[PDB]
Design a protein around this ligand. Structure first.
Ligand SMILES: COCC(=O)Nc1c(Cl)cc(C)cc1OCc1ncccn1
Ligand SMILES: [Zn+2]
Length: 140
């Protein structure tokens, strides 16, 4: 589990969104595994605006933050889980890093701020849904 809290937005994995998220919906995209809902309080996270390929992510199944190198956001074939059929995920970055299902929502961050959240992994893979292209998270 986990979310990004930027401005009056809450960014979560679409597959982990609650009824309150869906009832206060701003934007969602199944191909990216992302959903954004509105919040009453302002958040403290800042979004990175960059092309970094190194950063640090939080792994709840280890209670640890790990430094990683990660690929650029791409369209990458993702095998079945309980939430989607084997399908093509978009805006996804991969790293070698330990991963299990409930890890989704952990933040990946670089020197500029929040890069994305955990979404996929296995087999020593961890996939991050990128948020750096969502420039509107910084306004309104
Ligand atoms: C074995 O069931 C699939 C599963 O839940 N795997 C998975 C794992 Cl190990 C870890 C995370 C955080 C997400 C995951 O799910 C998305 C996903 N499905 C498949 C392949 C890669 N990423
Ligand atoms: Zn960066």
């Amino acid at each position: 589990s986990g979310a990004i809290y930027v401005g009056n937005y809450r960014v979560v994995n679409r597959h982990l969104a609650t009824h309150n998220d869906w009832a206060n919906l701003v934007w969602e995209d199944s191909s990216r595994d992302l959903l954004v809902s509105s919040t009453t309080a302002q958040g403290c996270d800042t979004i990175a605006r960059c092309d970094c390929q190194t950063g640090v992510y939080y792994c709840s199944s280890r209670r640890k933050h790990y430094p990683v190198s990660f690929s650029k956001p791409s369209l990458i074939f993702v095998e079945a889980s309980e939430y989607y059929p084997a399908r093509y995920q978009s805006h996804l970055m991969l790293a070698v890093g330990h991963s299990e299902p409930g890890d989704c929502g952990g933040i990946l961050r670089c020197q500029h701020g929040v890069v994305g959240i955990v979404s996929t992994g296995g087999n020593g893979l961890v996939g991050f849904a990128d948020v750096r292209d969502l420039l509107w998270l910084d306004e309104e």
